[PDB]
């Protein structure tokens, strides 16, 4: 709302930077527990009962549903 007159939300300043860093930290913390010989695998359930037990980061980030585009950037990375 204002004189900009765009049908959408706008974020500026430290807010958007904090949001991007929060998304990156969330993506990192998703797979941070599966690093090194003392890492552990993860179950992934595909909403229909299909189970995918894996430790590979690429598989985990591919199977996950991601909405924030910075998180998408990390998944594509």
């Amino acid at each position: 709302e204002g004189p900009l007159s765009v049908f959408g939300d706008r974020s500026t300043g430290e807010t958007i930077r904090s949001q991007n860093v929060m998304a990156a930290a969330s993506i990192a913390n998703i797979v941070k527990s599966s690093l090194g010989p003392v890492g552990l695998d993860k179950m992934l359930v595909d909403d229909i009962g299909d189970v995918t037990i894996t430790n590979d980061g690429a598989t985990i980030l591919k199977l996950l549903e991601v909405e924030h585009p910075a998180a998408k950037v990390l998944c594509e990375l």
Partner: protein, 96 residues
Amino acid sequence: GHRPVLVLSQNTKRESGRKVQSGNINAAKTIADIIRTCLGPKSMMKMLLDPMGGIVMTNDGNAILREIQVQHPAAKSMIEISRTQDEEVGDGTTSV
């Protein structure tokens, strides 16, 4: 308006820690206890109700396990190993 902004999509649950291990182990224990009594020469038979309307009255462990539906993925893994034992050697499905 202003649908909320968040990293992962909605209805995307995530558990972690000792709770996950405890849940998996209890699910396996429940699977074992389902057919614990169907082992040995003095085993008692069980009646399974097929969703299609049939009746499966059997003593085999794999036949009992494959006729039930579970939500916990650990129970799914246990049913899968039961099927694997049934296919590989033909018996020992409840022992495993």
